[PDB]
Amino acid sequence: GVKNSIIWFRKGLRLHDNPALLEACKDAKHVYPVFVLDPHFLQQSYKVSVNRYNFLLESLEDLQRSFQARGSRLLVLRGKPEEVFPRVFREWGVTQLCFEHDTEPYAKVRDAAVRRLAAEAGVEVVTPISHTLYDTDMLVARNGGAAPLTMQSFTKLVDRVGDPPAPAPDPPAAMPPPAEDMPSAAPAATGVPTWQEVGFKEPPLTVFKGGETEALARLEAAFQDPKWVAGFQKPDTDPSAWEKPATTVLSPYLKFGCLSARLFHARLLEVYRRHPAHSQPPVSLRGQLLWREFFYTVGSTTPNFHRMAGNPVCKQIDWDDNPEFLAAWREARTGFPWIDAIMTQLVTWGWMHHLARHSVACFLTRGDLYVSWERGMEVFEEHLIDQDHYLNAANWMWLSASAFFSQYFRVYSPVVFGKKYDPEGRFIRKFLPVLKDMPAKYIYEPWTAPLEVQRKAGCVVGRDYPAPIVDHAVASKACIARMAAAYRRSK
Ligand SMILES: Cc1cc2nc3c(=O)[nH]c(=O)nc-3n(C[C@H](O)[C@H](O)[C@H](O)COP(=O)(O)OP(=O)(O)OC[C@H]3O[C@@H](n4cnc5c(N)ncnc54)[C@H](O)[C@@H]3O)c2cc1C
Ligand SMILES: [Cl-]
Ligand SMILES: [Cl-]
Incomplete structure (x- = not known):
């Protein structure tokens, strides 16, 4: 025999x-x-x-x-x-x-x-x-033996290969069980433990529940408006939206395989066939699965992909050993409420919008603090519920202009970036309630509020909320100069 x-x-x-x-x-x-x-x-x-x-x-x-x-x-x-x-x-x-x-x-x-x-x-x-859309070793082989190194060339490759395989059928309604009286299958030794039983002392605070049942429910919620699915443009979505996140939040489900990537893709193609004006890669929702596939393909065929040294796609950059700056960032006490709110969402929810991750990753690395992306990756690895070895490494190398991306003159502002989406500061007030009463005019820059305003808001800078750990204009000028020199050394 059986x-x-x-x-x-x-x-x-x-x-x-x-x-x-x-x-x-x-x-x-x-x-x-x-x-x-x-x-x-x-x-x-x-x-x-x-x-x-x-x-x-x-x-x-x-x-x-x-x-x-x-x-x-x-x-x-x-x-x-x-x-x-x-x-x-x-x-x-x-x-x-x-x-x-x-x-x-x-x-x-x-x-x-x-x-x-x-x-x-x-x-x-x-x-x-x-787990992936394609056999990524097949993709490398069809590409001539090496992974594509740009998203555009990767997309051209998968299009030459054609559609991903269809999702497999559902399993039968009845499954053969374990044999009886097998000692290693004893129920008492083979149950799912609780977080308390595995040794955690503080409870989970995230709002996203695990499992395939939740994954499929959230898939259906994303597809309730096919026009939103069809017209999705990732760079145009709102990183300050938390009550109704602006993207699917399927990433933890895709990370654990609670949601099939091939199912998601097949459902996208169904919508796209009914909406010929639908968005195209990279910005489309299919483009997002292709970002994932791209980084899985390059990552899996690159030695030391999650490190700087010994990684052939990664620029060797002279990041500072600055534990004080790393700690202030990790602990959400940079003094920039947009940054600290996002880092609080990281620890509380384990998920933030892509451009929120952009803001905090740029700030830590090539934008303001000049701390290595490897250190940022480790903090994300601890807290993200969608923590994904290849995706976290690849995006940290992108955001620090170490691989795939090289335009180190583009630096997000920790003050202006979020204000363009959320001038009232609803996101800041949610994750940093110490600022909940700060007038919107100052909530991105509370150090500019008159002391009388800080006191009335119950939020005095230097006492209830820290002063900014850098001047952004000074810090970014310095980091850009260092990046330029590092690029010249790799010539
Ligand atoms: C510094 C940094 C670290 C990141 N670390 C991770 C990580 O550990 N795990 C992770 O899954 N994503 C990571 N991302 C990528 C991206 O931010 C998340 O995939 C996205 O925020 C998940 O939200 P969503 O499911 O609503 O995405 P949607 O926009 O709804 O996209 C659908 C799916 O496509 C994939 N996807 C979307 N954007 C990207 C991207 N930029 N790169 C790769 N795949 C993508 C994900 O599987 C996602 O669930 C990181 C990005 C940055 C800048
Ligand atoms: Cl995009
Ligand atoms: Cl900006």
């Missing part, structure tokens, strides 16, 4: 568009849905926010409910894959192990080791591509 399979979740935390799951179930007597949880992961070198970890746990709870509805259940195995799988292969009489391919660096090492162990145990391994 077929006993494992469907191993890592990303791809969904039942829809899951070719790995469909193969695991095919002709199977027993199917073991597995997630491998690392019970000491939170005891490391890298801190992880409860927001992101709890989003994962909610996503696993949703998978558990989906499998239970179909006569099965999710097995959250504790330990390391290379240690756990050899034992459960033999315990469960496994003949096939299926999982979605993952092109991240650690994934490649882990998966090579598991493939070796599967072969020793006589286990067939099936690893379909479905």
Whole structure:
């Protein structure tokens, strides 16, 4: 004989568009849905926010409910894959192990080791591509052996290849369950823990709930107005909108695979066929999935892509070791309310609009503080619920003019940028309530408010809210000079 399979979740935390799951179930007597949880992961070198970890746990709870509805259940195995799988292969009489391919660096090492162990145990391994739109190694190959290095050339490449594969069918309404009385499948050892049980001491504050069920609901909400979908232009959306965010907020769901990228793409093409004036890449909503695909393709084929040194696409720049500036930025006490409000949204929600990320990343790196993008990436990695190895690295290199982007004379203003969208400061007042009573005329520049106004607002600069840590005009002039010199050194 009979077929006993494992469907191993890592990303791809969904039942829809899951070719790995469909193969695991095919002709199977027993199917073991597995997630491998690392019970000491939170005891490391890298801190992880409860927001992101709890989003994962909610996503696993949703998978558990989906499998239970179909006569099965999710097995959250504790330990390391290379240690756990050899034992459960033999315990469960496994003949096939299926999982979605993952092109991240650690994934490649882990998966090579598991493939070796599967072969020793006589286990067939099936690893379909479905986290990305395309087989990104196929894209590189069709491009002549190297990844495109511009978004425009990347878009031309995928258009020559054609449409991404359609999303796979839904799985059957009933699934083969684990076998009975298998000790490694004992319910008490294989349940989804809570954030308290994994060791977090403060509760999650984010407003976006994990899981495939929420992902599909938010997909449908995005598609309730096909004219908005068709006309979407990313650079024209409003980073100060928080009650109704100006973009889809599907990124955490795409990061964890709660939402299929191929489903999203197929739904876009359906709308586009009915709206021939729809927006085109890069600014379109399909363009956004292509930004993701572009950075996955370059990132996966570039050594040390998430670092500066040893990264062949990355400019070597003489960033300052300035821990005081990094700390003020990380801790949302720069004294620029637009910046501090965005950094507070980072820690509270784990998600900000793309141009809000632009504002704070420019400020930290080539715009004002001249701190390395690697340090900014680490702070984002701790807190983002959509934290994505390749996307975070690529966008930090873009924003610091280290790769892909080189126009270091374009510097966002930490005062003016948000005011053009939100002159009343509704976003600032939401995330920085200490400023909730500051007249709009001063809310982006509270240090300019008369002391009488600061006192009446209950927000005295230097006491209740810090003074700005730099003069933007002075800081940006200095950073631009350093960037120019760094570019000349790389000649
Ligand atoms: C400094 C910095 C760090 C970032 N770190 C991350 C990260 O860790 N994870 C992440 O998913 N995105 C990251 N982004 C990209 C982008 O800001 C987010 O993808 C976007 O804000 C997610 O919101 P949304 O789902 O509403 O996007 P939409 O505009 O609705 O786009 C739909 C989907 O397309 C993808 N996408 C959109 N914009 C980009 C982009 N610029 N690059 C790559 N893919 C994109 C995402 O999967 C997103 O969910 C970063 C950007 C910057 C400037
Ligand atoms: Cl764009
Ligand atoms: Cl600006």
